Amino acid sequence: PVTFSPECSKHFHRLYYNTRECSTPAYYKRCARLLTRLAVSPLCSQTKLVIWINGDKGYNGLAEVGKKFEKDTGIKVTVEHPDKLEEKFPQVAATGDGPDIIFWAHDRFGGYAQSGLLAEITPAAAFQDKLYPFTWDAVRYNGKLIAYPIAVEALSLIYNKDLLPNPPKTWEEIPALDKELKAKGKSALMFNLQEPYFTWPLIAAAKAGLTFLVDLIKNKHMNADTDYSIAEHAFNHGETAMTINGPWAWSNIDTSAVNYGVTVLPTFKGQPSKPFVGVLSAGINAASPNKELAKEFLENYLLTDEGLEAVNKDKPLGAVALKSYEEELVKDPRVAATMENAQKGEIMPNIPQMSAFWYAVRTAVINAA
Ligand SMILES: OC[C@H]1O[C@H](O[C@H]2[C@H](O)[C@@H](O)[C@@H](O)O[C@@H]2CO)[C@H](O)[C@@H](O)[C@@H]1O
Numbered sequence: 001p002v003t004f005s006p007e008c009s010k011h012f013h014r015l016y017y018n019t020r021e022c023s024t025p026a027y028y029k030r031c032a033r034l035l036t037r038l039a040v041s042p043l044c045s046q047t048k049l050v051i052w053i054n055g056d057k058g059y060n061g062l063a064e065v066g067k068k069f070e071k072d073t074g075i076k077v078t079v080e081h082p083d084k085l086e087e088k089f090p091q092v093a094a095t096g097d098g099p100d101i102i103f104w105a106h107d108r109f110g111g112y113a114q115s116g117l118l119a120e121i122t123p124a125a126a127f128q129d130k131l132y133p134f135t136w137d138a139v140r141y142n143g144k145l146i147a148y149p150i151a152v153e154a155l156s157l158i159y160n161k162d163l164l165p166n167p168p169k170t171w172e173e174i175p176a177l178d179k180e181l182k183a184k185g186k187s188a189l190m191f192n193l194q195e196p197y198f199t200w201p202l203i204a205a206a207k208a209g210l211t212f213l214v215d216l217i218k219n220k221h222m223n224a225d226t227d228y229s230i231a232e233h234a235f236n237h238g239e240t241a242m243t244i245n246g247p248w249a250w251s252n253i254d255t256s257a258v259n260y261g262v263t264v265l266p267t268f269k270g271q272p273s274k275p276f277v278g279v280l281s282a283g284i285n286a287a288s289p290n291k292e293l294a295k296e297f298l299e300n301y302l303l304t305d306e307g308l309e310a311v312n313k314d315k316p317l318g319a320v321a322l323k324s325y326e327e328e329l330v331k332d333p334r335v336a337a338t339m340e341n342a343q344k345g346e347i348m349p350n351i352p353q354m355s356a357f358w359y360a361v362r363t364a365v366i367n368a369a
Contacts, residue, residue, distance in 0.1 A: 003074030005289075008044040048076040049294060052089065053103035055081035056248045057280070061314030065307050069297050075290075077297070093117045093285050100288040101298070105278030106138040106147065110350030112283065113141040119284045119291050120144045127299055135321040138279045138347055147281035148298050150308075151317035153246050154342040155201055155275045156334075157266060161259045163241040164188075171202065171212060171268040178221045181241055190231040191244035193224060196361035198244055201275035201345070203361070205268040212268065214368045224369035235260075247318030247338060262334040265341055272344040279321065279347070 015038055021027035022034075038044060049066070053059045059079045066077025080099070082088060086108045092098050094117065112118045123145070128136060135149035159167040163186055168174055178188035192198045203209040216222050223230075235243040236256035244265070253260050265273030282302070284294045301307050305325050311317060312329075318338045320326050329335050348354070 001071070001074035002046050004045075005043060005047055011038055011043060046074070046076050047290060047293070048078055049101060049290065049297060050099040051077065051079045051101045051103065052085045052099040053079060053081055054085065055083070056315065057081075057103065058248075058311040058314030058317070061311040062302070064310050065301050066297075069301050073293075073296075075293055075297075090115060090117060093287055096287065098285045098287060100285055100290060100294050102283045102285065103150065103280060104283070105153065105348070106149070106281045107276075107278060107348045107350050107354050109139065109147050109281060109283055110141045111352040111355060113144075113146040114352045117286050118146045119286045119288070120146060121148060121284060122295065123148070123299065130303070130323055131321045132323060132326070134347070135279045138350065139281050141350055147283040148303060149279045149281050149321035150303070151247075151280040152277065152319040152321060152339070152342055153248075153280055154277045154318075154338050154345055155198065155244055155246055155265065156262045156337050156341050157242060157264065158235070158245055158249070158253070159242045159261050159263070160235065160238060160240075161261055163238070167242060167261065167263055168266050171266045171273075174266070175216070175219065175221055177241075186238075187221075187234075187240045189222065189242045189244075190226050190234045190240045192226065192228040192231050193222070193365060194227040194362070196358055196365060197276060199365050200361065201244070201265055201273040201341075202268060204274040204276075204346070205271045209268055210364070210368065213365070217369060224366075247316045247334070250316045250334060251314070262337045264337060264344070273341070275341055275345040276348040277342045277345050280317070 012035070015034055016022050019031060019034065022031035051062065051066070053062060059081050063077070063079040066079060070076050085102070086104050089098060089102055090112060109118060131149055135152065136145065139145055139147040139149055157167055163181065164177070168177055174188055181188050199213060202213055217224050231243050232245070232249060232252065234240040236253055236258060238258060265275065267273065282298050284291055288294060303322055305322070308317065308320050308322055308325050312320075319335050319342070320329060330339060
């Protein structure tokens with residue numbers, strides 16, 4: 001099954017009947033030239049959906065869903081994961097270089113929608129009843145829905161059970177636990193310091209929290225240069241007892257054979273760690289020629305139990321926004337911890353200046369080194 005745009009036939013029949021060069025035998029060579037150029041042009045290629053998703057999510061699982069959508073409709077589906085896609089998209093979507101569907105945490109999506117780059121989505125009232133209502137409220141900008149909520153991500157504390165059978169309950173006791181582990185050739189805690197998404201849970205429980213984090217670097221309990229790749233390698237080789245990450249990382253820990261748990265983030269000054277909750281969402285490019293087709297792949301293929309499961313087997317989503325699948329998924333204790341850290345945190349805003357917010361928080365952490 002291969003589906004083409006209806007305009008390709010229209011252009012092709014108009015090219016034959018309406019052309020003087022196709023009417024008389026003297027000009028049949030021009031007629032063939034013109035028919036050949038149209039035949040190879042993009043308009044007469046098979047209709048495709050391009051999807052952008054971050055390279056740490058289950059794009060391989062998402063693509064199997066796309067191959068089923070192609071088995072049922074002939075609309076090819078191409079999933080890509082270009083780097084820094086949340087910054088390539090606004091530079092590229094007005095022209096014809098953007099995807100038909102973009103996946104990102106709901107917070108970048110306000111800047112896009114204010115710039116007119118996302119189409120307003122049209123779910124039925126019945127379809128919306130299948131998702132948790134606080135997730136629709138996150139993908140709403142100026143009273144308009146601008147994306148489909150996929151998953152609810154929050155950071156969790158992840159600990160190696162062989163090195164720390166009981167994870168700490170407070171941040172303030174991590175120095176003491178580090179001194180013990182360092183004697184065993186280990187360390188207590190590594191996590192990505194280069195992304196403010198990861199430090200904010202501690203800053204938000206602002207002056208004293210960033211201080212404690214700085215006093216952790218200064219007392220040699222952590223390294224200022226530790227980024228995502230450095231922390232995951234240390235944890236997945238059992239060189240550190242705790243890390244801070246989200247559900248996407250569970251896949252790589254299963255293969256390393258670390259006996260790991262997932263639990264609430266430790267408290268600071270007696271209060272819960274308040275991390276930023278992002279709703280992973282699918283937005284439809286306002287420059288897409290197949291907006292309606294993108295609505296059907298998302299409402300009828302992805303956002304069903306089977307579709308979310310095919311993504312989740314690749315890289316776990318954590319807690320999904322679809323109620324039917326979250327009542328099952330939440331029996332898993334890892335997802336329960338994620339839902340606990342989401343409860344005790346705050347959902348991030350989707351203002352257009354959010355990007356500048358993040359720049360400020362990133363730069364304040366780095367320069368505090
Ligand atoms: O670095 C700040 C960052 O925070 C959030 O991004 C997260 C994202 O939600 C997760 O999917 C993870 O995979 O990537 C980021 C952390 O490295 C915001 O959504 C994003 O706008 C912001 O840049």
